[PDB]
Write a protein that binds this ligand. Structure first.
Ligand SMILES: [K+]
Ligand SMILES: [K+]
Ligand SMILES: [K+]
Ligand SMILES: [K+]
Ligand SMILES: [K+]
Ligand SMILES: [Mg+2]
Ligand SMILES: [Mg+2]
Ligand SMILES: [Mg+2]
Ligand SMILES: [Mg+2]
Ligand SMILES: [Mg+2]
Ligand SMILES: [Mg+2]
Ligand SMILES: [Mg+2]
Ligand SMILES: [Mg+2]
Ligand SMILES: [Mg+2]
Ligand SMILES: [Mg+2]
Ligand SMILES: [Mg+2]
Ligand SMILES: [Mg+2]
Ligand SMILES: [Mg+2]
Ligand SMILES: [Mg+2]
Ligand SMILES: [Mg+2]
Ligand SMILES: [Mg+2]
Ligand SMILES: [Mg+2]
Ligand SMILES: [Mg+2]
Ligand SMILES: [Mg+2]
Ligand SMILES: [Mg+2]
Ligand SMILES: [Mg+2]
Ligand SMILES: [Mg+2]
Lengths: 48, 57, 74, 134
RNA sequence: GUGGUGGCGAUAGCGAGAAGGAUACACCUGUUCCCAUGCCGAACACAGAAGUUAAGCUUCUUAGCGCCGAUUGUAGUGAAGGGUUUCCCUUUGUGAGAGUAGGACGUCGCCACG
RNA sequence: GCGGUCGCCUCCUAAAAGGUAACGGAGGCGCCCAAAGGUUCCCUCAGAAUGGUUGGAAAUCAUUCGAAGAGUGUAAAGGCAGAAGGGAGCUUGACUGCGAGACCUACAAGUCGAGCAGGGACGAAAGUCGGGCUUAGUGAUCCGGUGGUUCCGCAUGGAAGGGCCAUCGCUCAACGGAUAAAAGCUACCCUGGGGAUAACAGGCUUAUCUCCCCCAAGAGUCCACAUCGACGGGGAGGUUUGGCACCUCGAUGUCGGCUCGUCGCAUCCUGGGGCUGUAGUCGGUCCCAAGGGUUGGGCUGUUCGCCCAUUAAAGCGGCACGCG
RNA sequence: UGAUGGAGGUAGAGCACUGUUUGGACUAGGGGCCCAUCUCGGGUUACCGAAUUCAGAUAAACUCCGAAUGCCAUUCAUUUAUAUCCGGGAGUCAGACUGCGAGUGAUAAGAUCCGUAGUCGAAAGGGAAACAGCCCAGACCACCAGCUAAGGUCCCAAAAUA
């Protein structure tokens, strides 16, 4: 239910982040604005 | 003025602090005369091992 | 049953009053701020106090009944 | 006597050096029973002495028990080897230090008081004596 | 003298009582606008100056509450010993807490105005 | 041996630094939260009294009292009302590369960390933000899997296949994990060691056992103490049941009986005496007394015990439960 | 060792919180009895009694307080001389008792487990009759020399029938 999760830069398709979430409370595919060091900017990181 | 100090009781069975006071004053075997100044440090050592020692002015 | 306990964690003071010390040092580990931070002192996630710069450690009463740590350099 | 509730079943036996903090002078009654030695005193002892005093007083006067058995005490069954934990609580006890007043009495003449306390003293383990209020 | 703003372990505080508004602080009149109230212009914010300082706020009294706090004496206890050794005692040194005597209804500054 | 435990966190024990053991006392963890984080702004609780409709003991409303007596995701401790507690906006710093220096530390690990750089959040700005209130929420390496890579590529180019970085798969929970993979009988047993380790006897202790004593409520026609003696208390002994494992494992023989006895006295008989609820005979009880004596058989391996029949009496114990 | 400054909540003390707890005043509330019964409102056993309050107590897992000691530190002082780093070589992981502080135990054990100091172990000698672990004291050797320690001085057996 509570699962460990690799996020991913939608552009680079690079994972770049590890995190946690419920599936009940956070069923929709999580997203954030996180730093991609390969681009050295901030970018929409989407769960995968 | 200075004071004379003499062991009159052994260091055996006595704790390390007393034994070290004796080593620091410089005394070894019993009935060992030594002469020191009248400092508060040495008067405190003498009060620490007064049972072990006789003194003289 | 009752036979178990955890690793004792080595809390309490680690630097002494009147003691020069390096920056980034540790002065007082604690769970909960039994002593507050003060001058040139920070506080970690685990409420641990650390000197940000060099200087002599000084502990002080923060008024009536709470304590403080401070680091006055030279 | 028993405490109706306790936070921890098992306790330490403790120590008994020194005189008592309080209960050291007679307050409610006119006469009282002072301990000259420190010792443990139990439910059964207290109740026996209380009944003795009351019967010799013929339900006259009033009695006050100042001590109380707050503490427990364990034991192992005969045949049990040491270890494998701590024993089960047998009964309840009061550590009574010297100087303590245990029983106070009033509302009864002086000779009756002295004799009742004499009886209770013979019932108790402690070496005791009499005390009077001003 | 009032207002603002800081430091000192409230010895500063809490309560009660008296007086004052010269400027001041305040209440106070409203919602016109910036802005706001899981409702309300009560609070926030804005604008004003009819009125009262009643309250708050200042200054004074009060030792009622709370705070501080000796001296003496004791318990405890380091060291050195003794005993009849789950404890007790002695020499020396230190030394509480409690209970008080007493203190205490503030001290130190900076700035603006009168 | 069973039970229980093995890893981690909190308290006590733990003896005012730290540390500190026990099969010592009490409890928890093997997670949760996308807001229960961050920032900015604002707010302060619990309960009691009073009154008020259903509405009560108690929902919700209002005033006062109210210093925390609440809450702090989750255990306990510490701490927090300058908030870490509570509410509303904007977000995602629950960032990347790092990291002087300290704490702890056998090692492996663990903890804190100002500050620098990049690129940002919030906020007017100061400035705070590298998760939560602090401390548990976890586990090696090997081995495989997934994604990326400017790395390598057995003469060359590739490829296969490896490496580096990120990450997943272990109640390997006996949690520093033996092997990818594993239960039992032995009285047919054997070796090597041990009094480091069981036990008899011995020793220390004496809870227990036996015996003795104190108080004396009461029973005794009345009368506490002729005789008993509740609830309670205090001792002796070292015959019982135990506790400790000090001696003995390069021997320790295990009970009972037989032969021989010896000792103690807490005396079964005989001997002396006091009290009597002792009319006399029988007695009861206590004090002194250990000189001698203290039976034969049926049953059971039995000690004991029951029975038969006598006895003046058919003692209790110790002497490695005397003596192979 | 002294001086100075700190952390720390122990023995003690105390009830200011958390629990336990005695007696008294009062009492919500809970019992019956009766009258009144639609079971509705009382009045009493000095009935049981929340809660408040007065006085008294209590605690390892309570603290408004809080020592002595011990600990850390001082380009502080005095006296002494061992601390650190690097490398070679080890052995030790069965410990025992005594005193003090605690637990388990039956606040019993020459018991068990820790702390603290000592001794033994690895230490002879003198005393405790004898007696690793107690008290005094540390054997480099010789002396038909002396002064003392604990412990002792009537004889065994040195010293006072002081
Ligand atoms: K007695
Ligand atoms: K042995
Ligand atoms: K053997
Ligand atoms: K034989
Ligand atoms: K030695
Ligand atoms: Mg943290
Ligand atoms: Mg005082
Ligand atoms: Mg400690
Ligand atoms: Mg090739
Ligand atoms: Mg080739
Ligand atoms: Mg292991
Ligand atoms: Mg063999
Ligand atoms: Mg053995
Ligand atoms: Mg042999
Ligand atoms: Mg006899
Ligand atoms: Mg026969
Ligand atoms: Mg036959
Ligand atoms: Mg035999
Ligand atoms: Mg205490
Ligand atoms: Mg001693
Ligand atoms: Mg032993
Ligand atoms: Mg010891
Ligand atoms: Mg050896
Ligand atoms: Mg010797
Ligand atoms: Mg030997
Ligand atoms: Mg001489
Ligand atoms: Mg002679």
């Amino acid at each position: 239910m509570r699962v460990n999760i690799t996020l991913e830069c939608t552009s680079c398709k690079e994972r770049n982040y590890l995190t946690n979430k419920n599936k009940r409370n956070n069923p929709d595919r999580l997203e954030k604005q996180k730093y991609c060091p390969r681009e050295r900017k901030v970018t929409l990181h989407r769960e995968t | 003025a200075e004071l004379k100090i003499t062991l009159k009781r052994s260091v055996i069975g006595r704790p390390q602090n007393q034994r070290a006071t004796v080593k620091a004053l410089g005394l070894g075997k019993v009935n060992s005369t030594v002469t020191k100044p009248a400092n508060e440090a040495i008067k405190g050592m003498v009060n620490t091992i007064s049972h072990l020692v006789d003194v003289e002015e | 049953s009752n036979g178990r306990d955890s690793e004792s964690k080595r809390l309490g003071a680690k630097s002494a009053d009147g003691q020069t010390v390096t920056g980034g040092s540790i002065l007082y580990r604690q769970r909960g701020t039994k002593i507050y931070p003060g001058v040139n002192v920070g506080i970690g996630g685990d409420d641990t106090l650390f000197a940000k710069v060099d200087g002599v450690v000084r502990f002080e009463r923060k008024g009536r009944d709470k304590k403080q740590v401070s680091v006055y350099p030279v | 006597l028993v405490p109706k509730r306790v936070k921890h079943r098992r306790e330490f036996r403790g120590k008994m050096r020194g005189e008592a903090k309080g209960g050291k002078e007679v307050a409610f009654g006119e006469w009282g029973l002072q301990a000259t030695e420190s010792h443990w005193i139990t439910n059964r002892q207290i109740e026996a002495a209380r009944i003795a005093m009351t019967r010799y007083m013929k339900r006259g006067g009033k009695v006050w028990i100042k001590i109380f058995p707050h503490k427990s005490y364990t034991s192992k069954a005969i045949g049990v080897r040491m270890g494998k934990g701590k024993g089960a609580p047998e009964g309840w006890v009061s550590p009574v230090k010297r100087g303590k007043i245990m029983f106070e009495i009033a509302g009864v003449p002086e000779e009756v008081a002295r004799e009742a306390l004499r009886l209770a003293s013979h019932k108790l383990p402690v070496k005791t004596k009499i005390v009077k209020r001003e």
